[PDB]
Structures are given as C-alpha cells and as structure tokens.
Amino acid sequence: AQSVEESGGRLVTPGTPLTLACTVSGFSLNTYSMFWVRQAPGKGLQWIGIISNFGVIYYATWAKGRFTISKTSTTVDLKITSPTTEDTATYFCVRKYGSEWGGDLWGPGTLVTVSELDMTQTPASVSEPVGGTVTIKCQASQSISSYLAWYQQKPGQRPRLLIYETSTLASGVPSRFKGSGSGTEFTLTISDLECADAATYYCQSTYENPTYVSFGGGTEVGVKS
Amino acid sequence: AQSVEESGGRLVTPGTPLTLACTVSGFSLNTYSMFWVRQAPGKGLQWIGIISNFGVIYYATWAKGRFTISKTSTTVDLKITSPTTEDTATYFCVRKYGSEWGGDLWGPGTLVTVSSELDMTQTPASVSEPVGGTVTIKCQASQSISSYLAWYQQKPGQRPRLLIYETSTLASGVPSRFKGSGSGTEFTLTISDLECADAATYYCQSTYENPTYVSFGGGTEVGVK
C-alpha cells in the first residue's frame, strides 16, 4: 500500500524556526516528485513549492525566503525560516502524478500554531437537494490549456483528487462528476447528488511552472434534508 | 405566520451610500428588538448592531461611523454611510429572543456587492465523524459571559438556525441529540447520533447584553464521512 504522512506540527512563538517532515511508504522519492500545500483554519488551499525526484526545487513567489524544502531518500522536509501568526495552518505534503503539477496522494496534514496567475471560483457556497445538480465555475487569469485538477475535501479530512487534465476521472470517482473547460473557463458538474458529496471542492492550475500553480478559493457544497 | 425579510441589496461603487430594509410579518416591532449581522462570501458571521423595541440603538465598536440603524412602525433600516470593497457581504436582520441578545428568527439575507472587547475562539475549525458518531465543539470567551451563549447551525448558502440559547436551553424544533453545556469562559456543543442532515457550519455567539461583549465564533465545519 502507498501512503504519505506529515509530522513536526506544534505551538511555537513568532520567529522561532520550525521543520516539518513528510515520510512516504510504498514508493521511492527517486521516482516521484513531492509538493507542500497549507490551509489556514476556515481559509482555502495554498501551494508553497515542489521538489523533483532529481531534487530540483521550485517555490511560489510569496514563499521565497519564508520556506526551505529539502529531501532524504524517504523524507521531504519543509523549514519555516521565521514564523509569524499568518503561518498558522495545516501543512500537507502531496505526491505529484506524472502528466501535470497536480497531486494524487495527500497526507493527513500537520497543524502549526504561532502565538502571477489568479483563479476565481464561483459560487462560494451552494446547497441543492438529494438527486440535484451543482455546477462550479473556475476562471483563470491566463490560459492554462488542459492543466486543471478538481479536489474534494470533507471537513477536517484531506483533499481527494476527483479530476485531472480538465476532464479525466481519477480511479474510483463515479461518472456523476463531469469536468470540462479549456484555457481560461472550466466547470465541474455533480449530477445525481448524494449526501456523501457534501464537501468543499477546489480547482487547481496544474500548469508546470511555479508562477502558474494556483488553487481556487473553494466552493462549499451542501445537501438539503 | 412569523417571518422576516431583508431588501435593498445591489451592486454599488465605493462611497455610494446605500440603505437596506428589514420588513417583519407576524409580530410587532413594539414588542421585539431587531439586530443586523453580515457574512462576506466564504467568511463567518459578524454582528453590526441592535435596536430595542423602544428604539435604543447599540453598535459594535468597529461599526461606529460606518453604519446607521433606524426604524418605522413596520421596517428596520440599516444605512451603510460610505461603503468600501470590505463591505461586500450578505446582510441579515434577526429578531432578538427575550432573555439574551441572541436571535431566533433570521431573514434570507440580502447581497451587497461593492466594486470598481470580547474574542470568541472556536475549536476545532473543521471535523468529520462517521454516521451514528459524536462531535464535540469548544467555544472559548476572552472575558466571563456567565450563561449568555447561543449555538447556530448554517448549511451552505442558507440562513443560520438557532439550536441552543442560554448555554443549554434547546430551541423549538431542535432534537435532544444537540447538547449545550459550559459556564463563564468555556462552552461546548455535543452532537450525539450523527446524521447526514447534521452536516453544517456551527457558530457560538456571546449573547451578553452589552455591545462590547456581543461576538460570534469563527465557525466549525462539521462533516459526516
């Protein structure tokens, strides 16, 4: 079985440096690239940076100077150089799938407490009845061709990949989830809604450049009963 | 017969003053106090101010200068004196229940778009348990607020529903699976025999009868997985 797990999260005082670890099971970091994502409580997902199987690192522009990535044979490490209260978040390491800068295997995340493409997601929140239809729209500042993934996140759980390459369905995801779009306009449609489908959904630019990798703000989907 | 409805929400340019109306059915503004709450998209609930049945107004400290409340025999009005982009939100009027500065009847809310001191800490931010499980949410007040605490339920894209007032007293229609407890600074909500219907955001609110002490928690997303 292939799995991923983060560790190192704890309470800390501003400026006290901190290192998090991401330990992998069932695959080699000699084969697979890994990346780090964070999520402040109540806020959405934010990309920090990526390290290739050959150890080439790319950081988001906002993260440069604030974070250091490094790796061992079995561990990917994230150092927070000089924390502030704005760095309070759950930190996830994610295993990159082959074709794009998206992730198929997420860790449970580790909580840290401290005492340029734009993606526009609509709507923010929506509830429809069991059997209903929901449509989420995602709009990209620049053209990202087919490099778009959709993730599902239940409250207090990790994101699950639903769709990669705009329309390709991940293994075990039912065909009720339909992805479509090209360039700047993308949509996810959930047909025959079920209670299990209630979650937050995020679009992500999986374009292979750190300037272009971006998460939408999220869409809370509820189911009426 | 008893209901509340807001009106006046629209797109506006920064600085253009705007008045919203709250019109009631089934009760007298001679008997009941009314208060205004706002909710930016994706963000949580924020109290603006209250007007008594006798027309005595209290504003949140942040709201002073930014908002004006007034009433006619059948309408409660909220004026935004000089809107900014930070004022973009759904605005709710709420009918105050007798014992505390909490609200039992909420309107659908009206959307305003603008385009060109007690602290409540809710733990955890997000949580999922399995159907039949138990969920426990903690709410922590900066100062002692005695038994003046209410719990609200909000499904995505809907209005809040009052569950519990006076710390432990169960509102009309709410099943006994919802248990509230606490005193002073430490309060908890427990949902027993979890159901799909229960998946929502839950907010605690200080219902202390002073404008410096009225505050909403940041919310807890509850999932059912």
**Claim to verify: residue B100 and residue B180 sit in the same structural domain:** no
Residue that has been written with the tokens 């084969």 in this structure: A31
B126 contacts in A (CB within 8 Å)? Answer: 41, 155-156
- The DSSP annotation for B22-71 comes to EEEESS-TTT--EEEEEE-TTS-EEEEEEE-TT--EEE-GGGTTTEEEEE
Determine, yes or no, domain membership for A153. yes
Coil, strand or helix at B122: strand
Owner of token pair 């082959």: A98
Verify that B15 and B96 share a domain, yes or no. yes
**Resolution, Å (one decimal):** 2.9
Residue keyed to tokens 């038994």: B147
- Domain co-membership, B97 together with B138: no
Instruction: Please indicate, yes or no, if residue B224 is contained in any of the structural domains.
Output: no
Residue A222 lies in a domain: no
Give the distance from residue A147's alpha carbon to the nearest chain B alpha carbon, in angstroms.
Answer: 25
- Residue B156 neighbours by CB under 8 Å, 6+ apart: A125, A126, A127, A220, A221, A222, B200, B201
Query: Do B132 and B180 fall into the same domain?
Result: yes
Identify whether B20 is part of a domain: yes
Domain assignment of residue A126, given as a range: 116-217
For residues B111 and B134, state if they share a domain: no
State which H helix or E strand residue A206 sits in: none
Do residues B94 and B126 both lie within one domain?
no
Per the structure, the count of domains in chain A is 2
A157: left (phi over 0), alpha (psi -120 to 50) or beta: beta
Q: Is B28 left (phi over 0), alpha (psi -120 to 50) or beta?
A: beta
Residues B22, B110 within the same domain: yes
User: Do A192 and A142 belong to one domain?
Assistant: yes
Question: Mutate which of A130, A136, A223 to disrupt the B interface (most B C-beta within 10 Å)?
Answer: A223
Q: Which of B39, B45, B123, B126 to mutate to test the interface with A (most CBs of A within 10 A)?
A: B126
Q: Is residue A224 part of a domain?
A: no
Distances (CA, A) of B24 to B57, B111, B153: 18, 18, 22
The reply to whether A100 and A2 lie within a common domain is yes
N-term to C-term CA, chain A: 37
Strand B126-128 to strand B149-154: parallel, antiparallel, or no bridges (unpaired)?
unpaired
Domain membership flag for residue B223: no
Measured between alpha carbons, how far is A72 from B6 in angstroms, rounded to an integer? 59
How far apart, in whole angstroms, are the C-alpha atoms of residue B162 and residue B145?
A: 19
Q: Are residues B81 and B107 in the same domain?
A: yes
What is the CATH classification number for the domain harbouring B161? Answer: 2.60.40.10
User: Which positions in chain A touch B156 (Cβ < 8 Å)?
Assistant: 125-127, 220-222
